[PDB]
């Protein structure tokens, strides 16, 4: 009714003739009767070097048969009234027009169980099966293709039905067998195809052979990657090689000779490389604050640069090699009054101040004590909130390989473990932004665990435990984006809401379009709906503000499209800076709107 699981009991071909039996059952055993429409498909595997030396296992798909009950059915379907079933295939492998069945090789039969209700009217969902197994016993075979693993492609997009041919297939192994050289054109094989289709995305994990390529239980043959070298396969990222004809290249006729020169220890690290470089330079330094505000309201800065083992160093020793130290000051960490621009409230912008540019100190950085040392402008220092300031901090090295560098014109950079710091005029514990609802760990599947927020226009943010101020139900430390809205103000960032800067906004409207984005829970471990107490309005255009629980919500949805309107609701859209706020609070969104990061679009009628 949830899930169907098949147990092949009976896997055979007799004189040509493909066999299955097999049974059925949903999430809790219970055998599933009266299946009404399954598709069928048959296959045989080409072991490794069977077709030339060097040449990896291939399918051949010999075709499908598609039963449907209440019409027609090629072959024989026999329910047996107790979750057991039998299907005998039309086809004989032997008459295949293309294709030489060999009973010594690997033989394959796949399942599609279409969404055709039970006739007594339960529900059932589309699922994949498929079973491997020796033409005359029935038994495991010898070889197999398990490559990759469906759960390393649902990562990012959930299920696999999301990707190609409406849903029909979840199971990556269904994807891998049909798509084959004799069925599929030239191009679109599984060794080339998926590589074609990532090598040019800009997604961190991406960049890491690993996000497709892992152990895996299901997984049998994963290590092939580095150890089945092929000119189709290698060729599918490294296109404009052609090894016929020997250009971007020594010439090979054939693919008998490439694992002779690559062998996999030496793929494997050349493809893990960079990623490896990173991690090791990214592990050199750490970083700690301090802020401590004055009487007269600014506040004084201190950075102390730290070695691999947490322990401060004098900053002159690696100040040669520091691209940029990028600092970014406000007020409130739970509502930034400190816009990116001049606020319409406190009238006063953001501190953006670096403190080292390209090796030299800027105008007010000192060094004291091997520290940095840099003191604000007036912050508008208040109560509550307002008496903490904070600041997210972004360092940016010059780097070759594994070592930090001192920076020339053309030099390599990376950058470096963000550092958040909190203060307090009065002298009191500081307020911190809440970091309950959105775990960095949720975007590192995606981004990888080397994401470089940021660089290219800026010194570049590594979110790791450097920034958690706080631990999780198993006392983990959580790694918050909450050093983000030091720019991603309540009044925008550059254009002053004309695109919605806004933090609370910001990630809903880069995602909103984005199609592996499909789940609140892709995000989201809980909602803070209580954060929006202390919230004020949302600039969302150009000096026009929004109330809040409406300026979040329409990062999606349009706010036309709300059919019960937002005027009887206490809210405003787009209005004064002060009207807007005055309304910020009167917003009964959540006396009917009860979202949970699983369906947020649950409603108390
Ligand atoms: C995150 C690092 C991913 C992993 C792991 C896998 N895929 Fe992917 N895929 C990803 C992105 C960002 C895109 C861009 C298209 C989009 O807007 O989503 C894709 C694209 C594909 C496609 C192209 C057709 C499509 O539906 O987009 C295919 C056929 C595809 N992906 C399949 C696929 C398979 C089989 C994977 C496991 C081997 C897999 N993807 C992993 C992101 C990521
Ligand atoms: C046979 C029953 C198939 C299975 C199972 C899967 N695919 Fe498929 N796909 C199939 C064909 C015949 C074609 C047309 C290509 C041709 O030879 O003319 C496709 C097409 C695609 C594409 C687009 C190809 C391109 O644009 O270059 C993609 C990206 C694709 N298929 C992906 C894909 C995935 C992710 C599958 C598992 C969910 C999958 N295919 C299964 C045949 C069959
Ligand atoms: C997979 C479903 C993702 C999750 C989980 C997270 N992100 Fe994402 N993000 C994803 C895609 C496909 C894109 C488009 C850009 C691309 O590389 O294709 C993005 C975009 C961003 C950006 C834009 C800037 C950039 O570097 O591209 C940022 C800053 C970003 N995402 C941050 C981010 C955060 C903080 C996440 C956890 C809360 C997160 N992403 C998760 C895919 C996915
Ligand atoms: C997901 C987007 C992938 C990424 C990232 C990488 N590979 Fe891949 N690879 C992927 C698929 C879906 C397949 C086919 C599996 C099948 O059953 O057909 C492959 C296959 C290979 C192979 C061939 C293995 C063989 O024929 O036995 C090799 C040698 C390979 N992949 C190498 C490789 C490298 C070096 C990568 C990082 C640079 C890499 N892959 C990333 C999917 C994905
Ligand atoms: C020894 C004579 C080799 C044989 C046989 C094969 N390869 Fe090769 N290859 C070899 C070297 C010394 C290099 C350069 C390595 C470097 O770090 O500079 C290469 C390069 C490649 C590449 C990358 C090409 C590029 O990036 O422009 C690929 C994809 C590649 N080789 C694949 C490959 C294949 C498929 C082979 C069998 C047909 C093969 N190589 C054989 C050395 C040798
Ligand atoms: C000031 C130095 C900033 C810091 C700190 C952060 N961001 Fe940012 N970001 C900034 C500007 C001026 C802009 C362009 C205008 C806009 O608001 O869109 C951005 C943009 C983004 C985006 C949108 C995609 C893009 O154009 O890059 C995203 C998704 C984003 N920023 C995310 C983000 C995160 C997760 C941050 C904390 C690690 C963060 N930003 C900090 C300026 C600044
Ligand atoms: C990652 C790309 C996200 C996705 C997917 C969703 N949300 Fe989100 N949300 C994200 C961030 C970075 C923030 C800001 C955190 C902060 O400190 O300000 C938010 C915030 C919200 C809120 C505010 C309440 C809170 O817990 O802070 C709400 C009510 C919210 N988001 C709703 C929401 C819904 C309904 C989503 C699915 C459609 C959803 N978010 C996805 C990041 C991401
Ligand atoms: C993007 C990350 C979104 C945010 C932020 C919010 N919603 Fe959403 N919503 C989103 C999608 C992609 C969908 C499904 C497609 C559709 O547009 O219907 C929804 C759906 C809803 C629904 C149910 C559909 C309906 O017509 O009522 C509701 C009731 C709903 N959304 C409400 C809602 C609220 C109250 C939000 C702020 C807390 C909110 N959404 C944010 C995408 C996104
Ligand atoms: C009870 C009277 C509600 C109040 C108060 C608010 N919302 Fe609502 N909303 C309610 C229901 C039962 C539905 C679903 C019916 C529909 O026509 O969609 C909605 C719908 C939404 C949506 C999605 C609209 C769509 O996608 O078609 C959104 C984005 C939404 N509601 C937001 C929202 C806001 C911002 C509110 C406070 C200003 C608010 N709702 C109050 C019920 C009720
Ligand atoms: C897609 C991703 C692939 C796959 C399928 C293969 N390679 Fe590799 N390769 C790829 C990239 C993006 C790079 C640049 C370095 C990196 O960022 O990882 C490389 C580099 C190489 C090199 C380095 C030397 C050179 O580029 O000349 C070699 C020798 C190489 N690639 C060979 C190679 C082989 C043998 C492959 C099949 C096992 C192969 N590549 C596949 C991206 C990708
Ligand atoms: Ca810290
Ligand atoms: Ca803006």
Redesign the pocket.
């Known amino acids: 009714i949830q899930i169907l699981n098949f147990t092949f009991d009976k896997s055979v071909i007799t004189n040509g003739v493909p066999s299955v039996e097999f049974t059925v059952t949903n999430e809790n055993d219970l055998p599933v009767v009266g299946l009404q429409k399954m598709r069928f498909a048959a296959a045989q595997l080409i072991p490794q070097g069977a077709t030339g030396a060097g040449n990896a296992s291939q399918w051949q798909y010999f075709g499908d048969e598609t039963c449907d009950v209440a019409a027609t059915c090629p072959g024989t379907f026999v329910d047996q009234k107790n979750g057991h079933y039998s299907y005998t295939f039309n086809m004989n492998l032997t008459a295949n027009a293309k294709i030489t069945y060999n009973d010594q090789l690997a033989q394959r039969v796949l399942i599609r169980a279409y969404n055709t209700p039970l006739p007594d009217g339960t529900q059932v969902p589309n699922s994949n099966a498929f079973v491997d197994f020796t033409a005359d016993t029935g038994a495991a075979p010898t070889y197999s293709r398990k490559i990759?693993?469906?759960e390393?492609?649902?990562?990012?997009?959930q299920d696999?039905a999301?990707?190609?041919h409406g849903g029909a297939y979840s199971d990556?192994n269904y994807?891998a067998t049909c798509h084959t050289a004799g069925k599929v054109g030239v191009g679109k094989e599984?060794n080339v195809?998926?590589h074609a289709?990532?090598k040019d995305?800009?997604?961190?994990?991406?960049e890491s052979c690993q996000?497709?390529h892992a152990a895996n239980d299901a997984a049998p043959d994963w290590g092939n990657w580095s150890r089945i070298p092929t000119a189709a396969t290698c060729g599918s990222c490294h296109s404009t090689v052609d090894f016929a004809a020997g250009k971007g290249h020594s010439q090979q006729l054939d693919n008998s000779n490439c694992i002779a020169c690559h062998n996999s220890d030496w793929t494997a690290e050349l493809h893990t490389g960079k990623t490896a470089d990173k991690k090791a330079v990214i592990a050199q330094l750490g970083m700690q604050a301090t802020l401590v505000g004055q009487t007269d309201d600014t506040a004084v800065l201190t950075v102390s640069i730290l070695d691999k083992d947490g322990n401060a160093i004098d900053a002159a020793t690696v100040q040669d090699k520091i691209k940029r130290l990028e600092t970014v000051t406000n007020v409130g960490p739970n509502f930034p009054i400190m816009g990116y621009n001049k606020s319409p409230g406190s009238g006063a912008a953001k501190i953006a101040k670096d403190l080292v540019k390209d090796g030299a100190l800027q105008a007010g950085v000192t060094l004291v004590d091997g520290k940095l040392v840099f003191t604000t402008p007036a912050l508008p220092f208040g109560t509550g909130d307002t008496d903490t300031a904070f600041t997210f901090i972004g360092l940016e090295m010059c780097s070759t390989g594994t070592s930090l560098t001192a920076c020339t014109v053309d030099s390599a950079t990376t950058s470096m473990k963000a550092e958040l710091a909190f203060g307090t005029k009065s002298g009191n514990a500081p307020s911190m932004r809440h970091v309950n609802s959105v775990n960095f760990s949720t975007c590192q599947?995606?981004?990888?665990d080397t994401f470089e927020i940021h660089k290219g226009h800026h010194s570049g943010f590594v979110m790791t435990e450097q920034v958690s101020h706080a631990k999780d139900a198993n006392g983990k430390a959580i790694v918050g984006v909450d050093g983000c809205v030091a720019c991603h103000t309540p009044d925008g960032t550059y254009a002053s809401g004309a695109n919605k800067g806004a933090f609370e906004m910001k990630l809903h409207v880069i995602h909103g379009e984005?199609?592996?984005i499909k789940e609140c829970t892709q995000c989201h471990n809980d909602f803070n709906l209580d954060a929006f107490k202390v919230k004020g309005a949302l600039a969302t255009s150009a000096g026009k503000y929004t109330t809040p629980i409406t300026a979040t919500c329409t990062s999606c949805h349009a706010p036309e499209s709300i059919g019960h309107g937002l005027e009887n609701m206490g809210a405003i859209v787009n209005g004064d800076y002060v009207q807007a706020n005055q309304a910020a609070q009167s917003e009964t969104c959540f006396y009917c709107h009860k979202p949970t990061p699983t369906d947020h679009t649950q409603v108390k009628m």
Do not use: E, R, Y
Request: glycine content about 8%.
């Open positions: 990759v693993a469906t390393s492609c649902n990562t990012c997009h696999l999301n990707v190609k990556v994807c599984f195809l998926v289709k990532h995305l800009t997604l961190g994990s991406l996000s497709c599947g995606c981004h990888s984005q199609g592996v």
